[PDB]
Amino acid sequence: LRAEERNDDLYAGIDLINNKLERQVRKYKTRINRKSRDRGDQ
């Protein structure tokens, strides 16, 4: 989980780092939360 901000405010920039962090975790989880696939064996 990487993210970068090139702001100078080291309190307002982390308001955007946590925004980019929270987006990337949801990409990771919905990648692996497609276990729910109805596959009935023969």
Q: Which residues bind RNA (CB under 7 A)?
A: 26, 29, 33, 35-38
The CB-of-38 to other proteins minimum distance in angstroms stands at 9
Binding-site partner at residue 29 among RNA, other proteins, none, CB < 5 to 8 Å by type: RNA
In which residue are the tokens 């990771």 written? 28
Assess 39 for contact with other proteins (CB under 8 A): no
Looking at the Cβ atoms of 6 and 40, the one nearer to other proteins is 40
3-state secondary structure at position 6: coil
DSSP state of 12: T
Contact 1, 21 (CB under 8 A): yes
